[PDB]
Design a protein around this ligand. Structure first.
Ligand SMILES: CCCCCCCCCCCCCCCCCC(=O)OC[C@H](COP(=O)([O-])OCC(O)COP(=O)([O-])OC[C@@H](COC(=O)CCCCCCCCCCCCCCCCC)OC(=O)CCCCCCCCCCCCCCCCC)OC(=O)CCCCCCCCCCCCCCCCC
Ligand SMILES: CCCCCCCCCCCCCCCCCC(=O)OC[C@H](COP(=O)([O-])OCC[N+](C)(C)C)OC(=O)CCCCCCCCCCCCCCCCC
Ligand SMILES: CCCCCCCCCCCCCCCCCC(=O)OC[C@H](COP(=O)([O-])OCC[N+](C)(C)C)OC(=O)CCCCCCCCCCCCCCCCC
Ligand SMILES: CCCCCCCCCCCCCCCCCC(=O)OC[C@H](COP(=O)(O)OCCN)OC(=O)CCCCCCCCCCCCCCCCC
Ligand SMILES: CCCCCCCCCCCCCCCCCC(=O)OC[C@H](COP(=O)(O)OCCN)OC(=O)CCCCCCCCCCCCCCCCC
Lengths: 175, 46, 70, 114, 88, 347, 96, 83, 98, 99, 318
């Protein structure tokens, strides 16, 4: 429909995870996460969070995952398994299908799913709050505090990234 | 289970190189024509 | 000569002209000779619903002014 | 635990100001400057009581004084207003920057006429 | 909605005109990992425009410039210890 | 490595745990755990040998996965209380989630198969860092949230460490493997007492830390990684083997050595908590540790072992490294039992 | 040149923000009545729908406090048709 | 001195991009400190009413706060007007 | 509680199962570990944006910039076992049997 | 903190964002700021074990604001018993329900 | 309503992309002293039609080593991306007024590299695979400078709203304020768009065709048109960024004339720049980027963040 669009996207998000959790060929597994990464931003986008969502596209989907499949490109064997290949991969995929079907069926009929966390099965929209945000975006004005309140965060995350640059050379140096 | 190496150095395996011998020449105007070249390289270094 | 590339250039200017006038004129047609009221923050949004709900015809673009109140 | 008290629909019925956004924003400066005390009373009540149902009466006066403000300007140069708020409407962001001459037209009644 | 409609229409147009064209007729790793670390460090200062309008921008000045010198510092250590001069 | 570049990697991880013990915010605790992992990997691969490459991979995958499991434990607690501060957890499954997540970072229960392999691959100098400093960071969080801990959840983790540490230690040959299993067995002792009173948890940590440095740096001086290789050191350096024996007895736990420091108070502490069957099993199964301590003690100094002719050449040259803090570490791990009432300082 | 122009834009924004400050009294008063008027229409409908159900105190308080909690949209719109729900919740987000 | 000047000259001889980068980065770190408009930037930054000026309960004894918005009492951004 | 969160919560669980179970390739395991922090990112943003916890918007950006540091380390280790063993299959990584 | 250098040095590194009722950019509320103010202000100087007992009512409300479990569960009873009345024709919607 | 605007945007974009092949062969020739396509069609007005029709009537070859699943998603992933990237362009009043449009444009620009990456894997040839491998690594290395240039430029502009570009750039072109970054930006456009001195893949002899090594007529239409499609826009993005025009609300015609002429002139320089320079060797790309372009961009971002603070010139995001 359109009311369940976040639910619809969330459903594609779960099945997208089964795509790469089943551990298919690394390129194909990356693609299964690429769509999973794509829809997940839309879930965030529907809740607001434009900037936080946009990063999932930019620095993760077009970022971390680009060099991810890039490594799989020059590595890996000469015979990449096609999604069907090993019967376990398709067995894992159908296995992921039966988990999301049983809960969703249970979610939309009895609405009293208690698996681990007790969760009531209503539409996505019955959780949004109310109120006007004035002239400032809540997400934009929050992470803009990186340089006004994010004092100890910047000092530590910056320092580790510099150590991140030095650790990667030291491991890749080859002594 | 064999005892671990005393120097802790496990024995190297054989070569794992990917020095593909590119066949330049009779497909690329880059070779100006009939200039079949046989040469190996470390991905980029001939 | 050199101007033989001009008709190749001119047709492009006609093609790129279409998006500029369309998305402007369509805005004028869908807003009633106006532009689409941008909503970059919450205030610009509930302002429209304020105007959309008062119009009675459920359109934000149609505006009722001093002739409406007494 | 217990019933949540909600004001009845009878006193809730209040004359709602039937004007658009452009007319409100065009005269917002003068509207805020002149009829402001009832707004401040309601504004303080909303932040102090923290309960909307306590200050609903002051909300009526906020509208009520708004009609008085719009009534006085209606008797005054309404035609310059129609010119002023129409050009303000023709702005996507309702920027006051574009409308200057018509803004001056409105400003030069209220300084002496009103 | 409009955003979804726009992207959906683009996919169909690409799909439609693809179909008519089908039925009718360590160095390599290092450049990847160095980009990854720089790109992640880049995402830190993306919120800079709105952050430039904070009410204590003096502290912003010390720390927004902090990340930028670390960007230089990470490259500087990379450059001096070979690094960007990739294996050849 | 370049001495200045190995220095910062050594003490970026020093700071990574330092953040954990001082952070009052849940995210910051994960931050210190991240720098803990990010600086641990290069040190494990200082020598660049396939054992180290395997050891780093096994260590990284285990610690990274535990870190990820820790995050959703943080998120669930946030999802149910909206509190980022470190206090008692406000939801059961979140409490159950991090206990296992923090356990895998430390490694006591079946999440312990990485501990032997990783230290076996990596060098002895990096072994002490992994087995001593890399245990304060997970333990600091556990001591912090001990109030909300699930008593059943932790204690079964505690025995499964000491029973596994006790049992498998008999069959181990490589000294690093034996040291790792004793570390697992020692890890169980303070984790068991953690729900009751964290003072003994810290007390067991400090003593165990002191004993392990005395063990590792002496082995570094011996330059030996196998029992037979350690056996030869009787002739060249008889004094070291004699000190090897006293710390083995100490770290065995026999009185009046400092190994009776943690157990006795731990035995006493749980006995005040009406848990009396629990201490007896741990004290009795602690003898499994003592057996391969005895096995090492027999082959090191108590009975001399055959040597080689070439090691007459070894006598002709003196040692070079000054093995800093070795003298004070040994004495602080053997004859500190009469200073038992000093445990009141920790609380 | 850009320094002078940017300073003018800041002058324009604070002028625009000032216009918002004047307009928010009426808007807050308008939304104040609207949000609780809709809540009452829920309450009157609530009485007619669960009069038959055995155990239900009409208008039962959700929170233990007697202080006015901000009413989330779920109880506000709720009963409204899916058109009203769709346009009001994901309205800002999908407006473009 | 002489070697330092020669060091810069040969730096500009073969490596002109980096000396341009270091010079610009070198400046860009120290004028914001001794800038005379930095305080102005803060002043106009706080002089942007994102949040409503919530009124205060008039209990007397406070003359600085204006009784009327147009009243002379209270802060003014006349400085922002000409600059 | 909204089904979108349970959709995310299983998304961790199915990602968790894939990371633990293993099939052949460490690339897939590294991929599975990324779905871990991914599903954590949407879950973090979803709660934080819903509750208007303004300062807490810190954590989503901070979360993945440090999770990506795992990729910087995890990807590097793979190529080394790829350089020495050949294929990065987990079965190859068995030298530390003792 | 295990080593509360935060308190000794008197300088803030992490407690700024620890709670949503703390200082916020441009003074915007954290949705449930009102409730968690009551709970925290109930719990100060009381101790962890005590506060979970006496300040339970405040915590239950604050969770209901934050978690919002039962409020929409009751709203579920509103809708489920609604469509289980219209489907047999026992209920008719007034015209303010639609427009 | 909305849909008629969608075709009114993408369709003229697509038809302009087909014609750009003509000028590529013509204005180069008129500089190369050649004549360019002239015989077919009056003044070569019909050559792109002849070009496009055989590509949609020639045999579409699927090499046996190519995965058909990967062989078909990639051309769609490329062409569609170029078209949906046009939706936030501020043509008087943009079709999509995404307040994060600058990030929106950049985000799917990174999504473009999956088009080449998958095609290089799909083709599955030794020479083809390395050709794409050392092609993607180029594009990703050029995005870091791309983001930094963007970040500095809109810092003086204001928020990331693409419509705000025309407001900040009211009296003076933004290039007069960031000309050291303009050429920094322009060369970056020359590299992501895969054009000489970064043609690399699509180089007629550099990689014979690079991403089109085994990839011929049929599906190849959506893989040699997409690169040319990004050319018109990424120059147009430069036109909005540094060469912004004036927009009268009562006559949006002026800004349509000005912007289209400005972006068309930039594309002429883009076609000018292929016919005047050699091709960078792979090492020279990184040497130019990481060691000269990357440090300079960082320094300029150092300068452009302090300057608004230096002169109290912070821009209003709203
Ligand atoms: C309670 C009672 C018990 C605990 C008492 C407290 C002390 C505990 C430790 C005792 C000493 C342990 C020791 O060193 O044993 C020898 C043992 C072996 O020494 P080794 O034979 O030289 O081999 C080690 C390296 O491979 C050698 O590598 P290298 O050849 O590159 O040499 C490196 C070395 C030699 O020096 C250098 O290389 C010079 C570096 C120059 C640049 C830096 C200048 C400034 C340095 C100081 C800054 C302050 O420098 C360092 O290791 C510097 C470390 C400090 C960094 C400070 C700056 C951070 C920013 O030490 C280690 O393996 C070091 C491990 C890390 C420190 C100890 C961690 C275990 C204990 C943790 C818990 C402590 C209790 C907590 C409660
Ligand atoms: C090293 C460079 C970074 C630290 C020094 C420069 C930043 C100072 C700063 O903002 O301190 C914030 C605070 C002091 O606050 P402050 O008074 O500077 O700013 C308060 C701002 N409001 C009111 C909006 C919250 O100090 C710290 O957070 C200490 C950070 C660690 C310092 C040591 C690092 C080693
Ligand atoms: C108060 C003032 C504040 C600001 C002051 C800033 C400093 C002063 C100004 C410095 C110059 C401007 C910034 C740097 C620009 C050069 C960057 C660089 O790396 O240069 C050297 C680089 C590299 O030169 P190189 O490789 O020979 O040497 C570099 C140094 N070593 C050897 C040590 C590495 O040159 C280039 O990149 C050449 C261009 C390559 C692309 C080919 C196409 C060029 C097309 C040119 C014509 C069209 C231009 C269109 C412009 C945009 C129009 C919209
Ligand atoms: C708690 C229970 C007991 C626990 C500990 C038990 C320890 C022994 C257990 C068995 C150990 C294994 C079997 C024996 C191993 C022997 C190890 C060894 O190295 O033996 C040979 C070695 C030869 O001696 P050498 O190193 O040459 O030094 C001689 C002195 N210069 O010998 C040595 O190196 C030993 C040197 C010993 C030096 C002793 C010095 C004594 C000083 C006394 C000072 C008194 C001051 C009094 C002051 C009074 C007023 C205050
Ligand atoms: C005004 C006040 C300042 C005036 C200028 C002072 C600095 C002068 C700089 C002179 C040139 C740089 C120093 C130098 O000699 O570098 C040598 C070397 C070059 O390396 P390479 O080009 O590879 O050649 C050798 C290998 N074949 O260098 C290297 O290998 C390392 C190069 C590192 C480059 C880092 C660039 C960072 C971004 C630009 C600077 C930003 C601001 C940094 C902080 C400045 C603080 C003052």
């Amino acid at each position: 429909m359109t009311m369940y669009i976040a639910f619809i996207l969330s459903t594609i998000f779960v099945i997208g995870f089964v795509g790469f959790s089943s551990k298919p060929s690394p390129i194909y597994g990356g693609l299964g996460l690429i769509v999973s990464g794509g829809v997940g931003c839309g879930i965030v986008l529907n809740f607001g969070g434009s900037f936080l969502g946009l990063m999932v596209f930019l620095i993760y989907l077009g970022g971390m995952l680009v060099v991810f499949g890039y490594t799989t490109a020059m590595a890996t064997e000469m015979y990449p398994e096609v999604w069907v290949s090993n019967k376990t991969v398709f067995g894992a995929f159908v296995s992921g299908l039966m988990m999301e079907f049983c809960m969703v069926y249970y979610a939309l009929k009895e609405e009293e799913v208690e698996i681990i966390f007790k969760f009531n099965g209503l539409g996505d929209w019955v959780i949004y709050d109310t109120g006007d945000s004035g002239f400032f975006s809540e997400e934009a004005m929050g992470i803009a505090a990186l340089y006004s309140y994010g004092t100890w965060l910047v000092i530590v995350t910056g320092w580790s990234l510099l150590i991140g640059v030095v650790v990667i050379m030291e491991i890749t140096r080859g002594n | 289970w064999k005892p671990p190496p005393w120097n802790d150095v496990d024995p190297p395996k054989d070569t794992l190189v990917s020095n593909l011998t590119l066949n330049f020449g009779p497909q690329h105007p880059a070779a100006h024509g009939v200039l079949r070249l046989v040469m190996e390289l470390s991905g980029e270094m001939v | 000569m050199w101007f033989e590339i001009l008709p190749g250039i001119a047709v492009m200017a006609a093609c790129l002209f279409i998006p500029g006038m369309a998305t402007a004129h369509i805005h004028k047609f869908t807003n009633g000779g106006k532009e689409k009221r941008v909503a970059h923050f919450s205030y610009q949004w509930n302002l429209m619903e304020r105007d959309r709900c008062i119009s009675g015809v459920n359109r934000y673009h149609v505006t009722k002014g001093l002739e409406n109140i007494d | 635990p217990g019933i949540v008290e909600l004001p009845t629909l009878e006193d809730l019925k209040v004359q709602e100001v039937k004007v658009s956004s452009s007319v409100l924003k065009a005269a917002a400066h003068h509207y805020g400057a002149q009829c402001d005390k009832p707004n401040k009373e309601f504004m303080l009540c909303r932040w102090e009581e923290k309960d909307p149902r306590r200050c609903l009466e002051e909300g009526k006066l906020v509208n009520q004084c708004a009609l008085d403000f719009f009534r006085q300007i209606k008797r005054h140069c309404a035609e310059p207003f129609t010119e002023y708020w129409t050009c303000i409407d023709y702005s996507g962001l309702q920027l006051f920057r574009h409308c200057r001459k018509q803004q001056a037209k409105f400003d030069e009644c209220v300084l002496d006429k009103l | 909605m409009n955003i979804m409609l726009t992207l959906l229409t683009n996919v169909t147009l690409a799909s439609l005109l693809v179909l008519i064209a089908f039925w009718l007729p360590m160095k390599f790793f290092l450049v990847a990992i160095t980009f990854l670390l720089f790109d992640l460090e880049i995402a830190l200062l993306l919120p800079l425009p709105w952050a430039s309008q904070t009410n204590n921008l003096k502290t912003m000045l010390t720390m927004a410039l902090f990340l930028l010198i670390l960007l230089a510092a990470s490259l500087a250590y990379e450059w001096t210890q070979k690094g960007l001069e990739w294996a050849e | 490595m370049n001495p200045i570049i190995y220095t910062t990697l050594i003490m970026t991880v020093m700071s990574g745990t330092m953040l954990v013990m001082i952070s009052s915010h849940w995210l910051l605790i994960w931050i210190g755990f991240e720098m803990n992992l990010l600086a641990m990997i290069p040190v494990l691969m200082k020598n660049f040998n396939p054992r180290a490459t395997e050891a780093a991979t096994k260590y990284f995958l285990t610690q990274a996965t535990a870190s990820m499991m820790l995050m959703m434990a943080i998120i669930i607690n946030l999802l149910y209380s909206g509190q980022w501060t470190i206090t008692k957890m406000f939801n059961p499954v979140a409490m159950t989630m991090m206990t296992m997540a923090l356990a895998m970072k430390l490694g006591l229960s079946p999440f312990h198969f990485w501990v032997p392999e990783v230290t076996q691959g990596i060098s002895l100098q990096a072994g002490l860092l992994l087995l001593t400093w890399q245990k304060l960071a997970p333990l600091s969080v556990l001591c912090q949230i001990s109030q909300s801990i699930n008593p059943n959840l932790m204690l079964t983790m505690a025995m499964l460490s000491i029973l596994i540490g006790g049992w498998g230690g008999l069959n181990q040959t490589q000294l690093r493997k034996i040291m790792a299993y004793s570390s697992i067995a020692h890890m169980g002792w303070m984790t068991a007492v953690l729900p009751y009173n964290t003072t003994m948890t810290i007390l067991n940590l400090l003593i165990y830390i002191t004993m392990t440095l005395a063990m590792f740096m002496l082995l570094i001086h011996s330059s030996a990684t196998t029992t037979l290789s350690l056996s030869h050191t009787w002739n060249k350096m008889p004094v070291i083997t004699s000190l090897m024996m006293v710390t083995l007895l100490s770290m065995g736990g026999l009185p009046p050595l400092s190994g009776f420091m943690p157990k006795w108070m731990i035995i006493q502490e749980m006995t005040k908590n009406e848990s009396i069957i629990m201490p007896t099993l741990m004290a009795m199964t602690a003898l499994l540790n003592l057996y391969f301590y005895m096995r090492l003690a027999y082959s090191s100094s108590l009975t001399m072992f055959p040597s080689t002719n070439n090691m007459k050449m070894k006598w002709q040259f003196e040692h070079t490294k000054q093995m800093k803090l070795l003298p004070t570490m040994i004495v602080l791990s053997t004859l500190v039992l009469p200073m038992t009432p000093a445990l009141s300082s920790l609380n | 040149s850009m320094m002078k122009w940017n300073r003018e834009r800041r002058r324009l924004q604070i002028e625009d923000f000032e216009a918002r400050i004047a307009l928010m009294p009426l808007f807050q008063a308008e939304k104040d009545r609207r949000v609780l008027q809709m809540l009452r229409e829920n309450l009157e409908e609530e009485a007619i729908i669960m009069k038959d159900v055995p155990d239900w105190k009409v208008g039962e308080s959700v929170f233990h406090t007697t202080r006015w909690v901000t009413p989330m949209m779920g109880e506000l719109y709720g009963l409204r048709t899916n058109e009203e729900i769709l346009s009001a919740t994901y309205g800002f987000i999908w407006y473009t | 001195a002489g070697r330092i000047a020669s060091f810069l000259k040969n730096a500009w001889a073969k490596e002109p991009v980096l000396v341009a980068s270091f010079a610009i980065g070198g400046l860009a770190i120290i004028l914001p400190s001794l800038s005379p408009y930095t305080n102005y930037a803060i002043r106009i930054n706080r002089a942007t009413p994102y949040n409503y000026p919530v009124p205060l309960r008039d209990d007397g004894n406070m003359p600085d706060v204006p009784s009327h918005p147009q009243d002379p009492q209270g802060p003014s951004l006349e400085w922002l007007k000409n600059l | 509680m909204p089904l979108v969160y349970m959709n995310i919560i299983m998304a961790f669980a199915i990602a968790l199962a894939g990371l633990l179970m293993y099939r052949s390739h460490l690339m897939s395991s590294l991929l599975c570990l990324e779905g871990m922090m991914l599903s954590l990112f949407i879950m973090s943003t979803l709660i934080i944006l819903n509750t208007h916890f303004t300062l807490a918007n810190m954590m989503p950006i901070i979360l993945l910039v440090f999770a990506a540091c795992e990729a910087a380390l995890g990807l590097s280790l793979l190529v080394m076992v790829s350089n020495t063993y050949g294929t990065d299959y987990v079965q190859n990584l068995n030298l530390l049997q003792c | 903190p295990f080593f509360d250098v935060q308190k000794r040095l008197g300088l803030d590194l992490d407690r700024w964002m620890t709670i949503q009722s703390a200082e916020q950019p441009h003074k915007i509320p954290g949705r449930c700021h009102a409730f968690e103010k009551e709970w925290i202000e109930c719990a100060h100087g009381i101790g962890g074990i005590r506060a979970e007992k006496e300040c339970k009512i405040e915590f239950d409300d604050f969770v209901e604001c934050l978690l919002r479990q039962k409020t929409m569960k009751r709203l579920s009873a509103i809708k489920r018993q609604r469509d289980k009345l219209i489907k047999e024709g026992k209920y008719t919607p007034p015209p303010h329900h639609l427009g | 309503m909305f849909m008629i605007n969608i075709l009114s945007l993408i369709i003229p974009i697509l038809l302009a992309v087909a014609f750009l092949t003509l000028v590529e062969r013509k204005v180069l020739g008129y500089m190369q002293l050649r004549k360019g396509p002239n015989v077919v069609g009056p003044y070569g007005l019909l050559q792109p039609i002849a070009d496009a029709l055989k590509l949609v009537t020639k045999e579409p070859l699927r090499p046996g080593t190519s995965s058909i699943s990967m062989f078909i998603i990639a051309p769609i992933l490329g062409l569609s991306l170029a078209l949906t990237m046009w939706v936030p362009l501020p043509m008087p009043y943009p079709l999509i007024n995404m307040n994060l449009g600058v990030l929106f444009m950049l985000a799917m620009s990174s999504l473009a590299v999956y088009s080449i990456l998958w095609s290089g894997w799909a083709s599955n040839s030794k020479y083809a695979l390395i050709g794409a491998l050392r092609a993607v690594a180029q594009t990703i290395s050029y995005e870091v400078t791309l983001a930094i240039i963007l970040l500095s430029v809109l810092l003086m502009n204001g928020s990331y709203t693409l419509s705000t570009l025309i407001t900040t750039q009211e009296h003076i072109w933004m290039i007069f304020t960031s000309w050291p970054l303009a050429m920094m930006w322009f060369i970056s456009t020359l590299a992501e768009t895969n054009r000489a001195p970064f043609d690399l893949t699509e180089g007629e002899s550099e990689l014979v065709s690079g991403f089109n090594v085994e990839y011929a007529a049929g599906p190849f239409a959506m893989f040699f048109m997409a690169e040319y499609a990004n050319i018109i826009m990424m120059n147009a993005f430069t036109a909005i960024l540094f060469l912004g025009a004036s927009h009268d609300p009562h006559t949006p015609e002026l800004y349509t004339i000005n912007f289209v002429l400005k972006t068309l002139a930039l594309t002429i320089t883009f076609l000018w720049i292929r016919a005047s320079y050699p091709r960078f060797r792979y090492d020279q790309l990184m040497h130019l980027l990481w060691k000269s372009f990357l440090p300079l961009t960082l320094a300029l971002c150092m300068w452009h963040i302090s300057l608004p603070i230096m002169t109290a010139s912070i821009p209003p995001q709203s």
